[PDB]
């Protein structure tokens, strides 16, 4: 029975550390974490905000608030998943917690605005640095990759006790907006609203130059970005690029989609190589986050996936390519939408979260990766928990041993007083029991080996062999065999 146990993590509040980098929720969190421990929870997850820690200047890392938080987590006996959060929290009207990237990095942007992902109207998104400047030494002598590596190194050095005591077990490497490996193709501040197709965000001058060079290398120096792509809130059939039998299928369209999605894959590969070097020998797993772009999954162009940077079509597996890049690093995939049913979505949105989840999980498993999930939206109800259960163990309980497939972990978004009171808490506690296959909490489940070095670098052409032939997902049971009640 024990091989069936799936760990449950809870995401801490976005301001677990205050926006002024002080640890102010000691009393509240201590009581809330006792409730999580009483409910069987294995660990918690927390954003380690770049804008808080490196806020005062280059290499002026102030870890003091995070240390107090971590001591609290250790004293509660919980495991911890740390997100290297190189992105902005919040920043839209009505957002409760606003934590930009460091001011001194934004200051560089006032002179070089092309450090930001830029759309076709020239709007600069300030939430993350363009993959275009990964290797450009624009930041008081450092490149973006060097800044990420130095931050991670400082983290390792300062949190060494927590790593050595087995408190920190997972490092999630932020690779874009919201920590997700994607482009900022659906920004509420630029006027996107669900279920718009989004936009290609490759207009910064660094990426424009990258494209020109890539185009000339295949004998087409004239070529340019597609301009028949509509705008954020269009539907696919209103554009010549995304409509059925549209120009996404042309030679030019294919080259551009590959260039755009490949750049994201290369961004992840190079940052994970540095992260691996940082954490070499520590008993931690590295993970990336893949966003769940379920809208337009039911139309042939998969338009919203394409603009996010996931080059996924009926005959092209744009998630298995990503999984193949992760293989050498022994990095895990953290996906979302674990809680969603297709029947819960708007019909206009052409949305298939269940099929998307099955595709991403099956891609990870076929590459031998650990796969974990999160819920996309707040849910407290049994149906949601049953949906997660189904995804956690797609073939149900195995009586004999471990199941053929299961999630390595599930992380619940997110902790607050609402979760640890009333019927919510009762539903949640019952969920954790079921995730654990009705066994008591085992803190020593899924032990980590010392992190080995990433295997040999493989080329983009090698990675892309994983795209085709596109395989059907593994079959998933329609309903969990171990429901909450
Ligand atoms: O606290 C982790 C993370 O949470 C948010 O992003 C998540 C989205 F809310 C969710 O819908 C899905 O897309 O997964 C995201 C990653 O966990 C915050 O917006 C993000 O800044 C923060 O790092
Ligand atoms: Cl295969």
TrEMBL record:
InterPro entries: GH, Glyco_hydro_14, Glyco_hydro_14_CS, Glyco_hydro_14B_pln. Its EC number is 3.2.1.2. It comes from the Eukaryota. It catalyses: Hydrolysis of (1->4)-alpha-D-glucosidic linkages in polysaccharides so as to remove successive maltose units from the non-reducing ends of the chains. Substrate binds at residues 47, 87, 95, 289, 294, 336, 375-376, 414. Pfam families: Glyco_hydro_14. Coiled coil: none annotated. Belongs to the glycosyl hydrolase 14 family. This is Beta-amylase. It comes from Hordeum vulgare (Barley).
């Amino acid at each position: 029975v024990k091989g069936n146990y799936v760990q449950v993590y809870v995401m801490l509040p976005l301001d677990a550390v205050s926006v002024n980098n002080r640890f102010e929720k000691g009393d509240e969190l201590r009581a809330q974490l006792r409730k999580l421990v009483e409910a069987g929870v294995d660990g918690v997850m927390v954003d380690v905000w770049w804008g808080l820690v490196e806020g005062k200047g280059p290499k002026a890392y102030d870890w003091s608030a995070y240390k107090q938080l971590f001591e609290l987590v250790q004293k509660a006996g919980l495991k911890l998943q740390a997100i290297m959060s190189f992105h902005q929290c919040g920043g839209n009207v009505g957002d409760a917690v606003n934590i930009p990237i460091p001011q001194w990095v934004r200051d560089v942007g006032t002179r070089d605005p092309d450090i930001f992902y830029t759309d076709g109207h020239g709007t600069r998104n300030i939430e993350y640095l363009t993959l275009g400047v990964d290797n450009q030494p624009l930041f008081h002598g450092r490149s973006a990759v060097q800044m990420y590596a130095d931050y991670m190194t400082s983290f390792r050095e300062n949190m060494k006790e927590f790593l050595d005591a087995g408190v920190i077990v997972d490092i999630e490497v932020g690779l874009g907006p919201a920590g997700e490996m994607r482009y900022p193709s659906y920004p509420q501040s630029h006027g996107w609203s669900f279920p718009g197709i989004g936009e290609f965000i490759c207009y910064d001058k660094y990426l424009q130059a990258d494209f020109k060079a890539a185009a000339a290398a295949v004998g087409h120096p004239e070529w340019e970005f597609p301009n028949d792509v509509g705008q954020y809130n269009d539907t696919p059939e209103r554009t010549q690029f995304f409509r059925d039998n549209g120009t996404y299928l042309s030679e030019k369209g294919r080259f551009f989609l590959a260039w755009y999605s490949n750049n994201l894959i290369k961004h992840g590969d190079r940052i994970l190589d540095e992260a691996n070097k940082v954490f070499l020998g520590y008993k931690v797993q590295l993970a990336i986050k893949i966003s769940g772009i379920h809208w337009w999954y039911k139309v042939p162009s998969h338009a919203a996936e394409l603009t996010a940077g996931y080059y996924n079509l009926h005959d092209r597996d744009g998630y298995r390519t990503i999984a193949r890049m992760l293989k050498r690093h022994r990095a895990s995939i953290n996906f979302t939408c674990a809680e969603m049913r297709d029947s819960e979505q708007s019909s206009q949105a052409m949305s298939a979260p269940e099929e998307l989840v099955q595709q991403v999980l099956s891609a990870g498993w076929r590459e031998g990766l650990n796969v974990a999930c999160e819920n996309a939206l707040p849910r407290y109800d049994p149906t949601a928990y049953n949906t997660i259960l189904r995804n956690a163990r797609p073939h149900g309980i195995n009586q004999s041993g471990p199941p053929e497939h299961k999630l390595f972990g599930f992380t619940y978004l997110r902790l607050s007083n609402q979760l640890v009171e009333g019927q919510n808490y009762v539903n949640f506690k019952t969920f954790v029991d079921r995730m654990h296959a009705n066994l008591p909490r085992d803190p020593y489940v899924d032990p980590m080996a010392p992190l080995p070095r990433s295997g040999p670098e493989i080329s983009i052409e090698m990675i892309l062999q994983a795209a085709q032939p596109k395989l059907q997902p593994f079959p998933f049971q329609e309903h969990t065999d171990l429901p909450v009640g």
